[PDB]
Design a protein around this ligand. Structure first.
Ligand SMILES: C[C@H]1Oc2cc(cnc2N)-c2c(nn(C)c2C#N)CN(C)C(=O)c2ccc(F)cc21
Length: 295
């Protein structure tokens, strides 16, 4: 059975916390992917249940196992907790911290300020989400883990309302690479050396975080609007970068453009990104900036 190494320790399937199946109740579907369903569950501990299809390959099984190992080994407030697993019964379960706010992309789109609720969100809310995820990314960086797929679709929120905390909630790409196709690669989140050379470092995630920042401050738009993957690949390789999201303060856009420096050595590490995000939250002219209310 497969092993996983993180920090200075090596772990095994036998290390995962197995929860007896009889203690687990499924409540409702949470919007299931195209491979594996996700449910709200109870163990009365509230959890999210990620399932493995009983109709799957040998590699599917091992991928599912690896994901559990990866998430169970992290210990940070901005990475979702793994409650445990139920692997000895079928279909197999991974039990995660329940994040009632859902994924970040849907949240941003669903919670955009509107004529009905014109103050659903403010600039400081967006800066706090970005700070939360940057804090998770800094943890990964200082522990030498490369996520490879930092994007709003892979972040979750503890709740819809003001006290929300954002966390990285999916590690499927890092799992795939740890051991597929061109049209499935998230090229719109990738730096040139990543999609040209297949070189990944912590500065890979820095670039992707810049794109996440744009997703956040655009309130859930798809990156490079109207551009296809190949067009973006050629655009970015030639020095092209996204314009500021609508109403985006200059100090915030400046963080994005630094994350997108062509040379990875010219891009900030996450300690520096965090310092700059914090300076934005202190600037009244940033946080007093009104977000666009779409009619
Ligand atoms: C594995 C899954 O985890 C959770 C999903 C949810 C809550 N808590 C956890 N742990 C969730 C979602 N939507 N809604 C309405 C809820 C609720 N309540 C998002 N979703 C369907 C996903 O598949 C998904 C997407 C991204 C990601 F990073 C992890 C996940």
């Amino acid at each position: 059975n497969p092993n996983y190494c993180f920090a200075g320790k090596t772990s095994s399937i036998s290390d995962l916390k197995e929860v007896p199946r009889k203690n687990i109740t499924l409540i409702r579907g949470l919007g299931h992917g195209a491979f594996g369903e996700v449910y709200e569950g109870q163990v009365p501990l509230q959890v999210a249940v990620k399932t493995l299809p009983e109709v799957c390959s040998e590699q599917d099984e091992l991928d599912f196992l690896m994901e559990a190992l990866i998430i169970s080994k992290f210990n940070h407030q901005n990475i979702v907790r793994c409650i445990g697993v139920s692997l000895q019964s079928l279909p197999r379960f991974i039990l995660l911290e329940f994040m009632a706010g859902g994924d970040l992309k849907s949240f941003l789109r669903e919670t955009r300020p509107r004529p009905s609720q014109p103050s659903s969100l403010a600039m400081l809310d967006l800066l706090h989400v970005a700070r939360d995820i940057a804090c998770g990314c800094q943890y990964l960086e200082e522990n030498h883990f490369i996520h490879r797929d930092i994007a709003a679709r892979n972040c979750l929120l503890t709740c819809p309302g003001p006290g929300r905390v954002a966390k990285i909630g999916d590690f499927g790409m890092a799992r795939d690479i740890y051991r597929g196709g061109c049209a499935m690669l998230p090229v719109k989140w990738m730096p040139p050396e990543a999609f040209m050379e297949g070189i990944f470092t912590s500065k890979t995630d820095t670039w992707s975080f810049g794109v996440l920042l744009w997703e956040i401050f655009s309130l859930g738009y798809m990156p490079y609007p109207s551009k296809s993957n190949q067009e973006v690949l050629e655009f970015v390789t030639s020095g092209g970068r996204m314009d500021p999201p609508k109403n985006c303060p200059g100090p915030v856009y400046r963080i994005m453009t630094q994350c997108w420096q062509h040379q990875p050595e010219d891009r900030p590490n996450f300690a520096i990104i965090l310092e700059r995000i914090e300076y934005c939250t202190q600037d009244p002219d940033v946080i007093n900036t009104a977000l666009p209310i779409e009619y």
